[PDB]
Design a protein around this ligand. Structure first.
Ligand SMILES: *[C@@H]1O[C@H](CO)[C@@H](O[C@@H]2O[C@H](CO)[C@@H](O[C@@H]3O[C@H](CO[C@H]4O[C@H](CO)[C@@H](O)[C@H](O)[C@@H]4O)[C@@H](O)[C@H](O[C@H]4O[C@H](CO[C@@H]5O[C@H](CO)[C@@H](O)[C@H](O)[C@@H]5O)[C@@H](O)[C@H](O)[C@@H]4O)[C@@H]3O)[C@H](O)[C@H]2NC(C)=O)[C@H](O)[C@H]1NC(C)=O
Ligand SMILES: C[C@H](N[C@@H](CCc1ccccc1)C(=O)O)C(=O)N1[C@H](C(=O)O)C[C@H]2CCCC[C@@H]21
Ligand SMILES: *[C@@H]1O[C@H](CO)[C@@H](O)[C@H](O)[C@H]1NC(C)=O
Ligand SMILES: *[C@@H]1O[C@H](CO)[C@@H](O)[C@H](O)[C@H]1NC(C)=O
Ligand SMILES: [Zn+2]
Length: 598
């Protein structure tokens, strides 16, 4: 009967979880070897091991039907069994799965191997995105140079893989349907365990959108003063190559030309980092110190022994796009980052170490629970610390920000600088998955796939390509996550919930009081706070053992994803900016782009 079976099922799950952890270790090692060293041999190795694990998952999913798991008393056992039924791509027939793996490695390796010719020297053709092209996009204020690098990169990283992307969409759809989801959109959304999740995000985005429109309007106004009206129009979408980022996802790199008060300080600690002899090692050691200062877990020896924290100097191809890795044993966690000594990179280091901390916090959990409460939780951890590291308060403590006077004008500069990252990103992140969802769901005909991309970027972000594109081009895969098949909604969720975590951690630390002028949210530093660390420990140690509202509740007693906290952080900016835009008669909104020919 059921009482005896539930006891046996508990024993079954205990052994299977350990077996899954061990088998996944092997897959992860092969994936790591390939990402660190792209060769035909490593690709073959990676894909063959994945195919082996997929075959085993099929056997597992099949075996779950031998247990009456839906009839069990234990919510915990039922949750584990449910996790094991979700095959994802592993549901595909053997040959289809092999084809998908080959398709995915073809796209990611194409992205990783992109090289372009120097704008000034057509003989020198070894410029990679990281660091060469990204350096130009972030630093150059020559609009024709910027336009050149934009076109060269999108042509090579995007258009070149159209046929592979098409087959990937077909196989992704086939896999979703084998799992009885309507499409890959629903398969992705299932990770959030909430059937109203899309509407919730629409509601939150709608609340923040007006602030984005104000930032967009002001930036456009300031760019007109820099480049002239021949380059930037008052009423049209902003030409995206002028925004300091290849994908226009964050605009912090053009802060020096769009800052509210150019005569007052704007935080940019890159020069001081270099002057003080910072290295990638030091940056990671400083991140480690931040976590341990909060009474959280120190980085294990394997991390230091096995991580790659600088771009290799041999001739080899690799994936430089920064990532954090769990090997599902004990204390085997690693980062691979082509680290540079900049302010932006210091935040990236803390982001990636947020993943590592999460891995360490939940490594005692059964295998199926060794992941984030939802994908957004994993992305939020390191960003909460980055918000603190970015404050004038913290940066003065570590001697990177000198002779800084925090008057009302400096505060507006800093809030604006943060918004150029945190608010600007929201419509971007939403469009990445809105686009792919529309393809997965079969809502866009193949003949319209490229202009469907640029239509969303126009509608939500008010940006456009520097040159005319058409259906002869295919631009979406020029973004890493699109070539690498990484869900993006996690980052939209993260940018909302990180402010919920930050606000709460700051209150717990005694660093934020809404009725005290000396403790504003935008200058909170949680460094050294064991109290904030305790909330993190309580939440992160849970892994995916409970639905995410229980994980949020463990942190601050709340159960709802809310835009209240992000709006609260930027409220002083909103008040100032609304008035400043009225003062300067700034045009808000944009006409439909003419940059994608149907
Ligand atoms: C996605 O959705 C799919 C449905 O759209 C779903 O596919 C269905 O899965 C069912 C398995 O759960 C399967 O049901 C079986 O059907 C067999 C006969 O099917 C034939 O005829 C169909 C048309 O009439 C054809 O379409 C098929 O191709 C087949 O030719 C039955 O023989 C079988 O029965 C046995 O199993 C049941 C189940 O027993 C359960 O467990 C315990 C066992 O101890 C029972 O006590 C308990 O009561 C419970 O019922 C037994 O009751 C029975 O005695 C037999 O042993 C079974 O009903 C179905 O065929 C299949 N397709 C369709 C079209 O319905 C996928 O599984 C879903 N995928 C995922 C990942 O969830
Ligand atoms: C650098 C970072 N890299 C990603 C790596 C994600 C990944 C998933 C699966 C296999 C390999 C890599 C991450 O750590 O989440 C990243 O891409 N991004 C995203 C981006 O740069 O597009 C959004 C960024 C928000 C701020 C922190 C960094 C976030
Ligand atoms: C890269 O992989 C090749 C074989 O694919 C191997 O021989 C070589 O040692 C690796 N290179 C480095 C730098 O690890
Ligand atoms: C550090 O964490 C432990 C449990 O992990 C806790 O018991 C202890 O109180 C914390 N240290 C401080 C100073 O609060
Ligand atoms: Zn991340």
């Amino acid at each position: 009967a059921l009482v005896k079976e539930e006891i046996q099922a508990k024993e079954y799950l205990e052994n299977l979880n350990k077996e899954l952890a061990k088998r996944t270790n092997v897959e992860t090692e092969a994936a790591w070897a390939y990402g660190s060293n792209i060769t035909d041999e490593n690709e073959k190795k990676k894909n063959e091991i994945s195919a082996e694990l997929a075959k085993f998952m099929k056997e597992v999913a099949s075996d779950t039907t031998k247990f009456q798991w839906r009839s069990y008393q234990s919510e915990d056992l039922k949750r584990q069994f449910k996790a094991l039924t979700k095959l994802g791509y592993a549901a595909l027939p053997e040959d289809d799965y092999a084809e998908l793996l080959d398709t995915l490695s073809a796209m990611e390796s194409n992205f990783a191997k992109v090289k372009v010719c120097d704008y000034k020297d057509s003989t020198k053709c070894d410029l990679a995105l990281d660091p060469e092209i990204e350096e130009v996009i972030s630093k150059s204020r020559d609009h024709e140079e910027l336009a050149y690098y934009w076109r060269e990169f999108y042509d090579k990283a995007g258009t070149a893989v159209r046929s592979q992307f098409e087959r990937y969409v077909e196989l992704n759809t086939k896999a979703a349907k084998l799992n009885n989801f309507t499409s890959g959109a629903e398969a992705w959304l299932d990770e959030y365990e909430d059937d109203t999740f899309e509407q919730q995000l629409e509601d939150i985005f709608a609340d923040i959108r007006p602030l984005y429109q104000q930032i967009h309007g002001y930036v456009r106004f300031r760019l007109r003063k820099h480049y002239g009206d021949a380059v930037v129009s008052e009423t049209g979408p902003i030409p995206m190559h002028l925004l300091g980022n290849m994908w226009a996802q964050q605009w912090s790199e053009i802060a020096d030309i769009v800052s509210p008060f150019p005569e007052k300080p704007l935080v940019d600690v890159s020069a001081e980092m270099e002057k003080q002899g910072y290295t990638p090692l030091k940056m990671f050691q400083m991140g480690d110190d931040f976590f341990t200062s909060m009474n959280l877990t120190k980085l294990p020896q394997d991390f230091w022994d096995k991580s790659i924290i600088e771009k290799p100097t041999d001739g080899r191809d690799l994936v430089c796009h920064a990532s954090a890795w769990d090997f599902y044993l004990t204390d085997d966690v690693r980062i691979k980052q082509c680290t540079r000594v900049t302010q932006d990179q210091l935040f990236t280091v803390h982001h990636e170490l947020g993943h590592i901390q999460y891995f360490l916090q939940y490594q005692h959990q059964p295998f199926v629970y060794r992941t984030g409460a939802n994908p957004g939780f994993h992305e939020a951890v390191g960003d909460v610390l980055s918000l603190s590291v970015s404050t004038p308060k913290h940066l003065e403590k570590i001697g990177l920000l000198k002779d800084y006077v925090r008057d009302d004008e400096a505060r507006i500069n800093q809030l604006f600088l943060t918004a150029l990252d945190k608010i600007v990103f929201l419509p971007f992140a939403f469009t990445m998955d809105k686009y792919r969802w529309s393809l997965f769901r079969g809502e866009v005909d193949k003949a319209n796939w490229n202009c469907a991309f640029w239509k969303l970027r126009d509608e939500y972000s008010g940006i456009e390509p520097p040159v005319v594109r058409s259906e002869k081009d295919f631009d979406a895969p020029a973004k890493y996550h699109i070539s690498a098949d990484v869900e993006y909604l996690r980052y939209l969720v993260s940018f909302i919930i990180q402010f919920q975590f930050y606000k709460s951690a700051c209150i717990k630390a005694g660093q934020y009081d809404p009725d005290n002028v000396e403790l504003p949210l935008d200058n909170c530093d949680i460094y050294g706070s064991a109290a904030a660390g305790a909330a993190f420990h309580n939440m992160l140690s849970m892994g995916a053992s409970k639905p995410w509202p229980d994980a949020l509740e463990a942190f601050n007693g709340e159960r709802i994803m809310s835009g209240k906290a992000i709006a609260e952080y930027f409220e002083p900016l909103r008040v100032w900016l609304e008035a400043e835009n009225i003062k300067n008669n700034v045009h808000i909104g944009w006409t439909t782009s003419n940059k994608c020919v149907s």
